[PDB]
């Protein structure tokens, strides 16, 4: 029963092993969980719309809230979870969602009311609402407006612009903030201590620095570093270099070579060095980000050069965000910034 769950969690990757089960495990998204804890004692949970960067804990927060609300018994009877792996057209929204909303709430047991608040409403959550078409979204308007007495709607998305304006107005907007080093160092250190991850001083803070506001990627990188340090068995501590090696970060010397080729060099030398660099597998997004950090941070370039480098890096990132060829985009970016 519970022991099987404990063992399955212990044999699970750290992303799912340390998933927040209660509203207190949320480390940084405090403004939303404060309201969620206050409404736990009341019974006026409004329709909610979670939006923010990926890996901020929206799904974990709503799961912990539904748990703390309904208990592990009513967790499976008063919840309608619809993900992006299911059909969510107009037909589905009109039939299934509306039939579940029109239905009455299931009767709680005697053990439920003694430990959990058991609100008189159920919860219908729609994860990854970006893939929902606007007509199927507008179909949900009156469905969530008239049956609010018996069901509550929780939308979850990454881009709040993909959801129509009426739905965004009907739901309370909860913006999840990026999890940088400051507001996630406590959670990362807790995960490291619970797994006996022996690292150096500036490793964890560096990991989140590579994560760029993503605790899931940081936990995955920490798990990979711990596995790589346990395989060696040397008993030493994990270093920031070993972490940034497996995180896809280009070494500093290779980036300085690119800066030298951009500063001094013609089209042919730059093209040859780019062709050689693309042989070693590096993500073009990470290279663009590192070049942006170097160029904007270095206090040795003119402001007129800085405006142009910022606009060129922005254009290159916008083009790379569409599935383009990394080699062509990187070569074009380096050539355009070399003419400056």
């Amino acid at each position: 029963s519970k022991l099987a769950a404990e063992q399955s969690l212990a044999q699970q990757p750290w992303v799912e092993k340390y998933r927040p089960k209660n509203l207190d495990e949320v480390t940084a998204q405090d403004h939303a969980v404060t309201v969620l804890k206050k409404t736990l004692k009341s019974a006026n949970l409004p329709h909610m719309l979670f939006y923010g960067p990926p890996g901020t804990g929206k799904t974990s927060t709503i799961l912990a809230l539904t748990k703390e609300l309904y208990g592990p018994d009513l967790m499976k009877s008063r919840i309608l979870e619809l993900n992006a792996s299911d059909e969510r057209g107009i037909s589905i929204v009109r039939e299934k969602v509306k039939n579940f909303a029109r239905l009455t709430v299931s009767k709680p047991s005697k053990h439920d009311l003694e430990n959990y608040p058991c609100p008189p409403y159920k919860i219908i959550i729609l994860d990854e609402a970006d893939s929902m078409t606007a007509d199927a979204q507008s179909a949900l308007r009156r469905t969530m407006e008239t049956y609010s007495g018996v069901t509550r709607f929780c939308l979850i998305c990454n881009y709040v612009t993909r959801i129509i304006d009426p739905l965004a107005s009907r739901c309370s907007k909860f913006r999840f903030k990026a999890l940088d080093a400051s507001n996630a160092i406590d959670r990362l250190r807790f995960i490291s201590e619970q797994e006996n991850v022996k690292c150096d001083d500036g490793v964890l803070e560096r990991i989140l620095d590579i994560s760029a506001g993503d605790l899931r990627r940081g936990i995955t990188l920490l798990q990979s570093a711990s596995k790589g340090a346990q395989y060696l068995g040397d008993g030493k501590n994990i270093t920031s270099t070993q972490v940034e090696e497996l995180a896809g970060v280009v070494p500093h010397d290779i980036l300085i070579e690119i800066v030298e080729k951009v500063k001094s060099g013609d089209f042919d030398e730059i093209k040859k060095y780019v062709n050689t660099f693309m042989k070693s597998g590096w993500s073009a997004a990470s290279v663009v980000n590192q070049l942006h950090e170097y160029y904007i941070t270095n206090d040795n370039f003119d402001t007129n050069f800085k405006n142009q480098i910022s606009w060129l890096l922005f254009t290159t990132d916008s083009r790379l965000n569409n599935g383009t060829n990394e080699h062509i985009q990187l070569l074009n970016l380096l050539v355009k910034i070399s003419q400056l």
């Binding site: 940084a28 403004h31 404060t34 309201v35 206050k38 019974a43 006026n44 949970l45 409004p46 329709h47 009109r94 509306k98 008189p120 409403y121 007509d135 507008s138 179909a139 949900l140 308007r141 009156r142 469905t143 407006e145 008239t146 609010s148 007495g149 881009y159 612009t161 304006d165 009426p166 107005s169 009907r170 739901c171 309370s172 907007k173 913006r175 903030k177 990026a178 940088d180 400051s182 760029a212 506001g213 997004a285 663009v288 980000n289 942006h292 950090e293 904007i296 941070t297 402001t303 007129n304 800085k306 405006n307 142009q308 910022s310 606009w311 890096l313 922005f314 990132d317 916008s318 965000n321």
Partner: protein, 327 residues
Amino acid sequence: SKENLPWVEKYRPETLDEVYGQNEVITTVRKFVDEGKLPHLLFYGPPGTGKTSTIVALAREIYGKNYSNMVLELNASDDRGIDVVRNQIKDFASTRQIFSKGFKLIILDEADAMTNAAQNALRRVIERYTKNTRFCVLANYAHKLTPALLSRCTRFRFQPLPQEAIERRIANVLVHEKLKLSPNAEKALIELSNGDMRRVLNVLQSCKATLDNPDEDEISDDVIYECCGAPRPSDLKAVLKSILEDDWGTAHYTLNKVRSAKGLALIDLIEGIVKILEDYELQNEETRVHLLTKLADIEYSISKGGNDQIQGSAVIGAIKASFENET
């Protein structure tokens, strides 16, 4: 009980006297109903202006407490096709009331999602059965309605809620709830609403939940800004000043510390800087052209993701290069 509904649903107007903001249309509709000549209505307006509440209170005032039986209310949640029209709407219009004597009311809420064939079939239902029933079409976009259907109804445009009416509703809510609100906090709340009562009610409930107290204290600007995650005018103007005057590295550091100290979003800062720079009396419009174009491009790129630092540096560089033409 009504104490379980959210504040958006709990405070839904039940009478025409509780619908604030709309005065020129509310008085005209009241006169239409009192004098008897109620034509086919077309309530066009943005979300959260009070069109559904207005028509519900109107049907309540017309038919009484039995509104839910003497009125045919169809919406996008219900299947609205051409056959649905042909059967249901025509059978409702051709027949009479089962509870009393009088004209009928068909409320086609959110009728901007109806098929073109459905509207083509309904435009002759509205013109044929016009002595025993009426039609009310609610819309947010007037381009999704055919011109033939658009010409058969009297159009009423629901303007966004002004300051006086939204403050009156806020005072009504603060009377109904054991809650106090600061004047500057109220002004900041009205600023982040754009005439949307739903947003105001939602964030008011959320900041009441944020209070953490038995509500013996007041709600200040800090509570509102920390609960809605919206940037403050102080940090907004500080970032704008550091971008316009200070150095590139210093501007980058200022933007980073501002967006990381309160967890602010880059899109909110972009919109705030756009709103602030709209009052700037500037030179030759080339700077404004470049600024608007680059800011809209960066906003459209943010709407799809990417590197937040790269986009922030892009915003800084765009504003700087746009203002470099003003010299």
